[PDB]
Amino acid sequence: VPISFVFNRFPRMVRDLAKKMNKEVNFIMRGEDTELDRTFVEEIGEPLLHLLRNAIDHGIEPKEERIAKGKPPIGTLILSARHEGNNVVIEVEDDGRGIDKEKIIRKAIEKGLIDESKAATLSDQEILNFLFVPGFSVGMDVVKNVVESLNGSISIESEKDKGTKVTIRLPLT
Amino acid sequence: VPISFVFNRFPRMVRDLAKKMNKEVNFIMRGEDTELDRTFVEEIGEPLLHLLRNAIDHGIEPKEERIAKGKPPIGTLILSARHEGNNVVIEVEDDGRGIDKEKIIRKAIEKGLIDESKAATLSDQEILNFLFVPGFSTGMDVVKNVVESLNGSISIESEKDKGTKVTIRLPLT
Ligand SMILES: Cn1cnc2c(N)ncnc21
Numbered sequence A: 001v002p003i004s005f006v007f008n009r010f011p012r013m014v015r016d017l018a019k020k021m022n023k024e025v026n027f028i029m030r031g032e033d034t035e036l037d038r039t040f041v042e043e044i045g046e047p048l049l050h051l052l053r054n055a056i057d058h059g060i061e062p063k064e065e066r067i068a069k070g071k072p073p074i075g076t077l078i079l080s081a082r083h084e085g086n087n088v089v090i091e092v093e094d095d096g097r098g099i100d101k102e103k104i105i106r107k108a109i110e111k112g113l114i115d116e117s118k119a120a121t122l123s124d125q126e127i128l129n130f131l132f133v134p135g136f137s138v139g140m141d142v143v144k145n146v147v148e149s150l151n152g153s154i155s156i157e158s159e160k161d162k163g164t165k166v167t168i169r170l171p172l173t
Numbered sequence B: 001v002p003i004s005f006v007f008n009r010f011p012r013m014v015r016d017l018a019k020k021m022n023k024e025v026n027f028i029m030r031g032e033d034t035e036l037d038r039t040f041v042e043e044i045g046e047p048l049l050h051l052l053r054n055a056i057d058h059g060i061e062p063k064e065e066r067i068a069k070g071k072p073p074i075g076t077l078i079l080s081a082r083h084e085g086n087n088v089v090i091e092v093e094d095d096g097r098g099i100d101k102e103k104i105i106r107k108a109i110e111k112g113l114i115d116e117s118k119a120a121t122l123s124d125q126e127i128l129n130f131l132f133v134p135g136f137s138t139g140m141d142v143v144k145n146v147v148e149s150l151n152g153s154i155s156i157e158s159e160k161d162k163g164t165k166v167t168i169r170l171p172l173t
């Protein structure tokens, strides 16, 4: 199945959400012809939608806040799919405000998931992965559960004020 | 004190192990003057020695084998320390045969820790993190327990035929 059967529904939904939330978003899709098992195509839509919503809502900042930060007033949201060996890699990237990793550590300490003493040397991926913990902050836990149900993997990378990339790796078949 | 109180013991240890294991090793130390708290100094030696042993035994290939692979004939082992912010970062890097990630997956499947379907989409760090599972070689768990007792973090990067870099990050408090 080409993944375009899902991707093609997104531009309108993104531009709807952006206008509702008062943001200017250049939405770019790449690799929409990428083919994989239709089971994957069918199930990956709802998780992807959540990731695109996350990016527009929590990631891209309103135009007035972009310009106050000296960023381009228009935000960029990229959804891509590509073959990597016999896997498919789907990426959702924004140039928004990024994930505050210090906030994640503070909340992890607050909720008793970790000791303050350990936090000073925690890895970035270890920190970002708290986002998949169900209480923490469909949610991101459910996105991870769907991916893992498909024998896939998910990762997050982010940098404050620069933006966020979520990568999903699925088997072809 | 300067980490040299630890590092100064290692050229002897490395040359003893290289001689015993019939291996030629170009051993380089950098950052020996990097200072940190006495607690760290007296606890960090044992983990480092384990990582140097690992590099000389399982990493660096015999000279004849390096020549046959078209590598620089003598293997290089670099132990370094530096300040990063309020942290100290210690690296142990070899240009040896690297960790076979396919072998890690085969072992993890054998041990029932993952099925074939989910292994196809593991990232490199997910694969290498099997090494820190207690009893996985039946090793790195022991290094990680000491580092985490010091509130530190450890990470591994490795590629086949290229070599291995183990990094340890310590709070310095
Ligand atoms: C919590 N959160 C989840 N996704 C994001 C994002 N894309 N940008 C900023 N914050 C986010």
Ligand SMILES: Cn1cnc2c(N)ncnc21
Binding pocket: B054, B055, B056, B058, B059, B060, B094, B096, B097, B098, B099, B164
């Ligand atoms: C399992 N294993 C642990 N450390 C190493 C190393 N440095 N090179 C090759 N194999 C290794």
